[PDB]
Amino acid sequence: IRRAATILAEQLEAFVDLRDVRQPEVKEEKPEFDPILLRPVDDLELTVRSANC
């Protein structure tokens, strides 16, 4: 039975021990000079399976 009653048993920690959970936003909107960043992987001199994935 326990998993079949868990959305009623594990609904109790819900009211105490009161630390919680969440995710962010992290990027910027792109792009300008100097062209040190304005380059594809072509500029790196690296292998082919890397260049596929």
Partner DNA sequence: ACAACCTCCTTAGTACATGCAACCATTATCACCGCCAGAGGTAAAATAGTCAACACGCACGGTGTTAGATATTTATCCCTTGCGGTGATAGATT
DSSP 8-state class, residue 6? H
Least distance CB 51 / DNA (angstroms): 11
Residue with tokens 């920690």, as numbered in its chain: 13
Least distance CB 16 / DNA (angstroms): 7
Residues of this chain, 12-51, that bind DNA according to CB under 7 A: 12-13, 17, 19, 47, 49-50
Q: How far is CA 52 from CA 3, 38, 46, 49, in A?
A: 43, 20, 11, 5
Interacting residues with DNA (CB under 7 A): 12-13, 17, 19, 47, 49-50, 53
